[PDB]
Design a binder for this molecule. Structure first.
Ligand code: LDR
Length: 115
């Protein structure tokens, strides 16, 4: 249901995406920049456990390709990326700590959505 505010909300989404990729958050965002290379990392069970991989470069391509029709669709992909991390790893793994920090950035700015 294309709403008049969808373009404006999508711009806010794109701003969040840019911030997540910025040097400000690089110390904890970097694992999420590119698709997990499970074979390279020796995680030979990754794709048996994670059926729907997601990462910030894929979100960016989807935004650039106008794949996301609304803010909700974008938000579901960013949250899928984090949930994949919380599903695969023990909760005390360093990468989970980084995911929680990056998700806090995401959620608090996503909540400042103009509407
Ligand atoms: O969920 C992840 N688990 C891992 C476990 C061990 C090494 C690396 C990663 C990793 C790297 C980049 C993004 C996500 C992950």
């Amino acid at each position: 249901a294309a709403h008049g505010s969808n373009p404006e909300q999508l711009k806010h989404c794109n701003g969040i995406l840019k911030e997540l990729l910025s040097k400000k958050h690089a110390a904890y965002a970097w694992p999420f920049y590119k698709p997990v290379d499970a074979s390279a990392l020796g995680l030979h069970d990754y794709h048996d456990i994670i059926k729907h991989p997601m990462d910030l470069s894929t979100v960016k391509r989807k935004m650039e390709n106008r794949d996301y029709r609304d803010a909700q669709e974008f938000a579901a992909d960013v949250r899928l990326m984090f949930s994949n991390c919380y599903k695969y790893n023990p909760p005390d793994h360093d990468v989970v700590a980084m995911a929680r920090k990056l998700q806090d950035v995401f959620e608090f700015r996503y909540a400042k959505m103009p509407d």
